[PDB]
Amino acid sequence: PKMKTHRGAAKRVKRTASGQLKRSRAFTSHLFANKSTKQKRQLRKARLVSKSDMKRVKQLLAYK
Amino acid sequence: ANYDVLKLDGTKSGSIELSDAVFGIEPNNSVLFEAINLQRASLRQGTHAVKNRSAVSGGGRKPWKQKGTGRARQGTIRAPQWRGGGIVFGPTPRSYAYKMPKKMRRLALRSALSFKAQENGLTVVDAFNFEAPKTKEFKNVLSTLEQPKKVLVVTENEDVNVELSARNIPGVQVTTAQGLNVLDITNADSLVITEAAAKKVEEVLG
């Protein structure tokens, strides 16, 4: 039948123009007293899913 | 371009002009082949099926205990290795038809009608005029027109008497101008089109 989508993932990544996936960052919910001011604005950004993980999850997000 | 119009007798009457965008293109053998495969696949009423290990009668009891007997471990008398057991992955009821883009379907009818106009197998006749069904007379017409054992006759709309006359001549099929199909034009070694059907086929296919 029609293949489904990892709904848990569709809420975490936006698809970018060259087919990349823009992801949000980790280590950013609490315990900020234990992380530096440098770590915090360099975590206030967006990175791309690394190609190794892309090879792992290509189909979980095929319809995005 | 200009094909000779003959009478049912074979004597030249007039001449008609069929376009080269319909009856004179360079045949695409890649598109014509895919269209022939499609039609032959679409004709398969696949109604072929077998029974797997769930549909064979009975077979629910472990035939013997798992350990202790010296026999191989078995779970049903209807397993695939058993005589009388379920089939693994055989035929299942399915269809075989597919589709091609519309424009490609049109280049395949044109390509078949252009092959049968390069090999000189397109005889445009003026009309047909059969006022009652008689087969012996349709054989006389196709022999006086020197048409090969295999010919496809094309009328304008449904011509009841022309159809009832060629149903039994072995090797002749009768088709309307809209019901032209590739498998039929490509089997036929010769064509015989009514001038009205020839102007209709130029309008529709180009």
Binding site: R25, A26 | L32, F33
Partner: protein
């Protein structure tokens, strides 16, 4: 081409790889699945995204954002896509739908500015960008927002 001499298009067809039929084929005994483990079993393999119990990527990462159930996104027509019309000619959304430059009016029409006019004409759309406005007015012609 004759029905008894036909040929398929070159390189268009290929015979598929039957597995588990003799050693010579190169996929004889194990059918290309190695020796043991889940990969070697029927219906085996592992669910995609699974990482051997390691926390999967898409739970290491946080969700963000929402969806504004009511978006106004428009079928966009670029500046250079308007030089398929003519001079002075009074284009409209219906006219450009007929011309087929827009396959469907999604929630309106938006003119953006990329190329050039080479023309002088009036327009009537739903929304415009600044560049569209100056690019139309430079050559002359109005833009009646509807």
């Amino acid at each position: 081409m004759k029905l008894h001499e036909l040929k398929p298009a070159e390189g268009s067809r290929k015979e598929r790889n039957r597995v588990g039929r003799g050693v010579a084929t190169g996929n004889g005994k194990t059918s290309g699945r190695g020796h043991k483990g889940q990969k070697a079993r029927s219906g085996g393999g592992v669910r995609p995204g699974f990482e051997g119990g390691q926390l999967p990527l898409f739970r290491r990462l946080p969700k963000r954002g929402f969806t504004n159930i009511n978006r106004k996104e428009y079928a966009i027509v670029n500046l250079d896509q308007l030089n398929k019309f003519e001079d002075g000619t009074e284009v409209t959304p219906a006219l450009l739908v007929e011309s087929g430059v827009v396959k469907n009016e999604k929630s309106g029409i938006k003119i953006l500015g990329n190329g050039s006019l080479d023309k002088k004409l009036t327009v009537k759309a739903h929304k415009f960008s600044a560049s569209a406005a100056e690019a139309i007015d430079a050559k002359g012609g109005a833009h009646e927002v509807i």
